[PDB]
Symmetry: C3
């Protein structure tokens, strides 16, 4: 039962942070690890693994920590690192962090990730707001009778607030694939034909779960590389992390400022 | 064993209805529940849960009953309600009803469903004959060695008979997705590029199983809403059922008239 | 563990063939069974079922044997027949043959298969080099941390060598689907829009596993039929095998000559 698991996790979060309720939750993805400090000074930092239902993150660049940080007038839950479907876990565990955050009081989820850029105007190191997504996993974190509407899944309101922080920000459609292998050039051309501007291996299910649980979502992708075949250069996870690190300053600053505007 | 479980179901059906063999089978989908009255008067009504191999339907608007109704010169098996892949059951259970119907003698399957409309001409409340489908579930109810040809999976002959009943009936390509979450506007634009005119969360596997079993198929979608992003308005299951109810009488009358022409 | 099972299978291969190491591996797919003779005179022939981790092939036209054949200056492992995902096995077993071959020393994998033709200039009986693929199975044979780059997954270098044998060889993008049901005409139109020139039910995962393991790949499809909807004619596995048999002479000769050029 996802509901009870989330409640139990939320209770532990309240007991360890000393805060009965949090207002916003942020998940830092690949390349986003160094952006955690700019969010503010944490009042609590603990291992995600400590929390009920939390499968510890294992991918490089994912700290696997939970931080409670005051940002603006909000108490923010920072999920430094996430698990992915390609790691083999049931989607119940993949979306648990977001559900636990919701049970802890968070009504706004800021989901960040690294992504390959498909639209010609996107450059490596550029943060892109997610306007919508393409779930190409043939799966759903929802089960039986949960008919959730995904119109405005990525709140236009939150994207406008983000632009208030940095009017420069572009938007794009995120394609969520299973992974863990990167795409072939032909698959990238296919994704372009399908309307995708960004490609990654997470987020879509978490967004679906967040909406199903009544929370708004702000998605932010960091273009860590141009999609396969666009340049012809080889992609590697280390390169993804390195690319993300180069924009850590802007990223951390952006998150801190936008969240304060919520 | 699928075949043997289908035979057991067909036998219980014969015993309970007192009819040794049926000629046509109809599966009523979301919103079609109240269309049963217009089909004719049942000689027998029983719970699907009482039939071997039948996983009971659980989605709202799915009665989970089996009726034996005489329509014209045919003895018709009416499967009021169905189970869906999003309910978590293996496909053998999802296509079992159709296989049991075939074992009961049904050589024609009338698969009805609710669907979101993507093509510009479609209106809410409009019945649409399925001309072909797009299986976007990445699954199949068939196993090794079952290399079934899907050309004319939706019998042109039956669509021809349907138009004889209502000359104004339009046709469309149905895209079958996993569900249970509705599609994002971006996914809808993607489906239009893929050639989809209607979008749903059932039917495709049942059609495949029916063809593999040697039965002809007539697919009928009731546009219960325009696809996500077309109107921007929210989608909800209650609304799907409500829309279906507004057209239930017409749908039942249509089915009765078409089937009598078989 | 996949790697351990692979190394173990490789030790058995070495022992039963008396050959401590092989240089090239070739997988013969549907319709390719008779092309084995032209490869050369085998020094050892044994059932795949007798090797660790090898699930026996079951589809008609797949011998299920492993042959050690000297071709040119190379010691070649010939996998006569393969298993498919539609047979229900975990992808670990589907890609095991390739991983075992790599562990046995093979740094080049020649993956052959039967495929439906989508591009208008491709004819039944025509061999087509795979330039790239579209993995439309929503799956991957890899697990967490195995972020493999798939640029040039099908070695341009090996395709060049292939053309030195037959300068008239055409290239095409292969779409890998789950199967086992054949595609609907609407699905074929979709595949064309997605950039597919060939459609099949294997190879993509084996290619991914090969690349992840450090082996180059040469993919060769034999157009055994025009895709569904192109002609309207019925498709069947027997016809696929018959079509393949009609070009077995050309294929066996092609394989023997190309491998000798490696
Ligand atoms: O080109 C790409 N294709 C698919 N995903 C990504 C990502 C995103 N994350 C990064 C990480 C792999 O390096 C995995 O969890 C996917 C960055 N670039 C790409
Ligand atoms: O817009 C749509 N997208 C996907 N499926 C449907 C359906 C069909 N059924 C209806 C039902 C959900 O309300 C589920 O079993 C899917 C109607 N409208 C849509
Ligand atoms: O039209 C086609 N669609 C999908 N696969 C194939 C193939 C390839 N193999 C052949 C075999 C089925 O007959 C199965 O393992 C798929 C040949 N023609 C087609």
């Amino acid at each position: 039962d996802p509901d009870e698991l989330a409640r139990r996790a939320a209770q532990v979060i309240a007991d360890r942070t000393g805060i009965g309720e949090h207002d916003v939750a942020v998940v830092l993805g690949s390349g986003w690890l160094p952006a955690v400090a700019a969010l503010g000074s944490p009042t609590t930092v603990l291992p995600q693994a400590e929390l009920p239902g939390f499968v510890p993150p294992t991918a490089a660049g994912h700290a696997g920590e939970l931080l409670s940080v005051p940002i603006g007038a909000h108490r923010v839950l920072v999920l430094a690192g996430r698990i992915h479907a390609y790691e083999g876990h049931d989607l119940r565990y993949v979306v648990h962090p977001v559900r636990a955050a919701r049970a802890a009081g968070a009504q706004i989820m800021v989901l960040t990730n690294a992504a390959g850029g498909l639209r010609a105007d996107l450059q490596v190191g550029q943060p892109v707001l997610i306007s919508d997504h393409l779930n190409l996993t043939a799966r759903s974190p929802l089960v039986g009778g949960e008919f959730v509407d995904l119109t405005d899944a990525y709140s236009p309101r939150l994207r406008e607030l983000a632009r208030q922080s940095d009017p420069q920000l572009a938007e794009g459609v995120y394609a969520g694939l299973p992974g863990p292998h990167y795409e072939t050039p032909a698959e990238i051309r296919m994704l372009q034909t399908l309307g995708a501007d960004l490609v990654g291996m997470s987020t879509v299910h978490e967004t679906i779960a967040a909406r199903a649980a009544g929370a708004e979502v702000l998605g932010v992708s960091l273009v860590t590389n141009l999609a396969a075949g666009i340049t012809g250069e080889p992609l590697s996870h280390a390169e993804v992390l390195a690319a993300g690190a180069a924009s850590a300053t802007r990223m951390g600053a952006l998150l801190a400022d936008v969240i304060a505007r919520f």
